[PDB]
Design a protein around this ligand. Structure first.
Ligand code: GTP
Ligand code: GDP
Ligand code: TYR
Ligand code: CA
Ligand code: CA
Ligand code: MG
Ligand code: MG
Lengths: 440, 420
């Protein structure tokens, strides 16, 4: 039942959305025209996949999703592409002029012209739900729309849906693929503004994904297409418990109980395995032990940081495919007797396990080998704060000279907003230090 | 003292309750369609304690199934004996309780509870002489724990002169779903101290250890745990369900087992548990490895004990062996309650066994269980960890402080009689 509405904001949010929804269709046997032969209840139902897809009387399975961007060219590709029939046109929303890598334009100058229309479209999706659970919001930190429009939208969703859950998948900037010098300003501004409005946020460091593609898939120079296919496998792992049933399946909301010890401490670290090429996977079966071991290898993390140099407040293992508890328990025991896994003194140390039996899927033409079993670890580690420290320092370097600040002030913002946001980030860093200190 | 009304709440509560009904249905010769096909008159003599009769000699469990989400009860309804329950007695919401006592007790549960009481009232109304209620639930989740204890309070308000009995599954970090279990269990235990007459304390750690250490199950499932619980619940209710002299109703049991109103938390045990003579049965039933609260009986004293033997066996030998246990370990039975062990025997053995025994002990050692929960509670509460899940439902920290104090008081009251 419990429906989830996905909102894909700006270029990164939209292109990652493309990859996710394509992958979901393949996992569920939904064709590009939205038909699903295996679904025998026409025009509706309460199957697990219905959390993410509504149905029309003509048998179309329609994503519960809105795609929004302030310029039209990325969403235009969706409108004209392979899955164009999947979406009702009103779910794909564009303006004419983008935010120009400026949070201020995304939140105020341009964003304000389209925010009411976007809310109207989201309301139309919500009115079709019988038990809406919440929202999943996909966006970059660095873009003007991804940063500024997302913030505005999150603020408005708090007002219109109260404390209905809002989760983010947030794309953290990397120099190898970034397109604006001001991305650190945009990141801090949006992180500050969204913090009280988000229940849980999964950061995806483009640099971490870039190096996984280069190192584990032998891709010379990863493109967004390469990055997004990997990201979608990870998002799929996280949402699989919402979209599939199963005796050993554990709901994402139940993992969230363990992952969020205080409202602001809501940024889990995801680590995914196995990421391997067809050439390397051939004749090589990677066992539960092997993929579990890989979750404690920092090179497989979706955010660059070193958990061996922090403390854990939760560890969750989300398995999919050919996996049974006996083998998981054995792998965990081995890891316990060999790894730098130290918990804070106020949290239990047991790992929380879920298993979804539906095996992983890959998109044709992709880089990942098709495997029989995979795992996503979600941990709450103080180490994730290193990501904020890196961004915060870049912010400080430029802000000390007020470099580029006139672009924001010109669009109506005040320096006071910059210092407020940065102070909130300094407080968040301190929060992460404090939770790690032993109890008196 | 005839009818008992059974309530099962939340995931654990419904999963164990379903198994309980399958097991005693089999024992009473009732098939999944509610038809009787037994060969002994003992089967029907007291069948009305747990079952109503319907047209066509049909028997229907006096059972109410409660949950804040549909999943587990959908599974029950699809289960083996699922069609035996009264369809109108499935009472459920859609939103779930998120493993959150506050959601079960104050918000989500509050919205559903009147409709549960309506069904309870309908069942109670067709009782010639209602003894009281039995509730199955866990203390570590949201619905069984929070809503289950809310129900108990409202039932007591409406039926204050009836007995309230619970089978209450206590959480353990070794067999755990979430980190907030100790908060949910602490909040619940205070409700149970006040509003139940008899609570069977079933520790998931004990169940796990029996499955793994004793039964040699390498990887126990909740299903394996529930098989043990099933068997135990059948054993402890034998005296209510069949002709007999001792502990034949919930009040007489309470009067025999509860010398001080708050100390009504029992350790149950079962024998045999194997990977059988009367002596062996008797030794195994008093064996700590056969008990289900993860407390060492030698770390305390027995205030009262009920033993129930099942199968065809020499009552002479039963009496002899029970005397031998008390006379040879007399220090573990408080001397200021003379003759505090009572024994019953029922000729009808459980399925698959020629003889069995069930143990119900009121032991001061049970304080160890409350101590473990108290420690786990404090480890988190000292840092106010995970409390936003509860404050978001309107609770304040002071309610946690009070529950913790209440449970520490319970622990202190046991210890007092341990040194008495
Ligand atoms: N992983 C991934 N990152 C992307 C993708 N597209 C853009 N990015 C990253 O997103 C940031 C740039 O923000 P965008 O999403 O392109 O910008 P926008 O939201 O459309 O905002 P404006 O164009 O300023 O209105 C940079 O850090 C890019 O590397 C993508 O498809 N995948
Ligand atoms: N023995 C046993 N324990 C269970 C079962 N299901 C859940 N639990 C335990 O019950 C507690 C969680 O509560 P649960 O009943 O699932 O939550 P609820 O639906 O909100 O009442 C934890 O301590 C679990 O270990 C079960 O089928 N058997
Ligand atoms: N020492 C504080 C740490 C803390 C961190 C972040 C917070 O938002 C709140 C508190 C505590 O555990 O209570
Ligand atoms: Ca359907
Ligand atoms: Ca409600
Ligand atoms: Mg753009
Ligand atoms: Mg549960």
């Amino acid at each position: 039942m419990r429906e989830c509405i996905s909102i894909h904001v700006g270029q990164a949010g939209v292109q990652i959305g493309n990859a996710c929804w394509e992958l979901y269709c393949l996992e569920h046997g939904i064709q590009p025209d939205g038909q699903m032969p295996s679904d025998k209840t026409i025009g509706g139902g309460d199957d697990s996949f219905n959390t993410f897809f509504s149905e029309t009387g003509a048998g179309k399975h329609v994503p519960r999703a809105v795609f929004v961007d302030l310029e039209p060219t990325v969403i235009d590709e969706v409108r004209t592409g392979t899955y164009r029939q999947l979406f009702h046109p009103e779910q794909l929303i564009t303006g004419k002029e983008d935010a120009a890598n400026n949070y201020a334009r995304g939140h105020y100058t341009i964003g304000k012209e389209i925010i009411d229309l976007v809310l109207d479209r989201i309301r139309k999706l919500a009115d079709q739900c019988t038990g809406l659970q919440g929202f999943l919001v996909f966006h970059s930190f660095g873009g003007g729309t991804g940063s500024g429009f997302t913030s505005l939208l999150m603020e408005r969703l708090s007002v219109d849906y109260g404390k209905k859950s809002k989760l983010e998948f947030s794309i953290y900037p990397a120099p190898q693929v970034s397109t604006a010098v001001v991305e650190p300003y945009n990141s801090i501004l949006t992180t500050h503004t969204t913090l009280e409005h988000s229940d849980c946020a999964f950061m995806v460091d483009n640099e971490a994904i870039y190096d996984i593609c280069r190192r584990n898939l032998d891709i010379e120079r990863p493109t967004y297409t390469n990055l997004n296919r990997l990201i979608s496998q990870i998002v799929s792992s996280i949402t699989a418990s919402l979209r599939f049933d199963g005796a050993l399946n554990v709901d994402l909301t139940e993992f969230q109980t363990n992952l969020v010890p205080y409202p602001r401490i809501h940024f889990p670290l995801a680590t995914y395995a196995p990421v391997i090429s067809a050439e390397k996977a051939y004749h090589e079966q990677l066992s539960v032990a092997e993929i579990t071991n890989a979750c404690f290898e920092p090179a497989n993390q979706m955010v660059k940081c070193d958990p061996r140099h922090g403390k854990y407040m939760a560890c969750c293992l989300l398995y999919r495919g050919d996996v049974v508890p006996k083998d998981v328990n054995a792998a965990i025991a081995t890891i316990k007797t060999k790894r730098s896994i130290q918990f804070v003194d106020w949290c239990p140390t047991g790992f929380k396990v879920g298993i979804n039996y539906q095996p992983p899927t890959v998109v044709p033409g992709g880089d990942l080998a098709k495997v029989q079993r995979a795992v996503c670890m979600l941990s709450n580690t103080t180490a994730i704060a290193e990501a904020w420290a890196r961004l915060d320092h870049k912010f400080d370097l430029m802000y000390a000279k007020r470099a580029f600040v006139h672009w924001y002030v010109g669009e109506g913002m005040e320096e006071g907003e910059f210092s407020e946001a940065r102070e909130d980030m300094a407080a968040l860093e301190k929060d992460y230090e404090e939770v790690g200190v032993d109890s008196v | 003292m005839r009818e008992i009304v059974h309530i099962q709440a939340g995931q654990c509560g419904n999963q164990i309750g379903a198994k309980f009904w399958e097991v005693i249905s089999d024992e009473h010769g009732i098939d999944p369609t509610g038809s009787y096909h037994g060969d002994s008159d003992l089967q029907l003599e007291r069948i009305n304690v747990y079952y109503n009769e319907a047209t066509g000699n049909k028997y229907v469990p006096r059972a109410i199934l409660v949950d804040l989400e549909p999943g587990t009860m959908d599974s029950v309804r699809s289960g083996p004996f699922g069609q035996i329950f009264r369809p109108d007695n499935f009472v459920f919401g859609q939103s779930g309780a998120g493993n959150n006592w506050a959601k079960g007790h104050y918000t989500e549960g509050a919205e559903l509870v009147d409709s549960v009481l309506d069904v309870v009232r309908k069942e109670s109304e067709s009782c010639d002489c209602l003894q009281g209620f039995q509730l199955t639930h866990s203390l570590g989740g949201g619905t069984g724990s929070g809503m289950g204890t809310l129900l108990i309070s409202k039932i007591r308000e409406e039926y204050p002169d009836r007995i309230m009995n619970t089978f209450s599954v206590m959480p353990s970090p070794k067999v755990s779903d979430t980190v907030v279990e100790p908060y949910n269990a602490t909040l619940s235990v205070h409700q149970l101290v006040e509003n139940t007459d008899e609570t069977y304390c079933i520790d998931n750690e004990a169940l796990y250890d029996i499955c793994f250490r004793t039964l040699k199950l390498t990887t126990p499932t909740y299903g394996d745990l529930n098989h043990l619980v099933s068997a135990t619940m059948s054993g402890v209710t034998t005296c209510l369900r069949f002709p007999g002299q001792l502990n034949a109703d919930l009040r007489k049991l309470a009067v025999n087992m509860v010398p001080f109103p708050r100390l009504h938390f029992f350790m149950p045990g079962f024998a045999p548990l194997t990977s059988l003579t009367v002596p062996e049965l008797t030794q195994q039933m008093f064996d700590s490895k056969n008990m289900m609260a993860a407390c060492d009986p030698r770390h305390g004293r027995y205030l009262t004990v009920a033993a129930i033997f099942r199968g065809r066996m020499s009552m002479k030998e039963v009496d002899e062996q029970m005397l031998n246990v008390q006379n040879k370990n007399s220090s573990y039975f408080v001397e200021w309650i003379p003759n505090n062990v009572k024994t019953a025997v029922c000729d009808i053995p459980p399925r698959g066994l020629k003889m069995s025994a069930t143990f119900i002990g009121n032991s001061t050692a049970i304080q160890e269980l409350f101590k473990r929960i108290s420690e786990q509670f404090t480890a988190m509460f000292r840092r106010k960890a995970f409390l936003h899940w509860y404050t978001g439902e309107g609770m304040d920290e002071m309610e946690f402080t009070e529950a913790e104090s209440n449970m520490n008081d319970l622990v202190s009251e046991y210890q007092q009689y341990q040194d008495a």
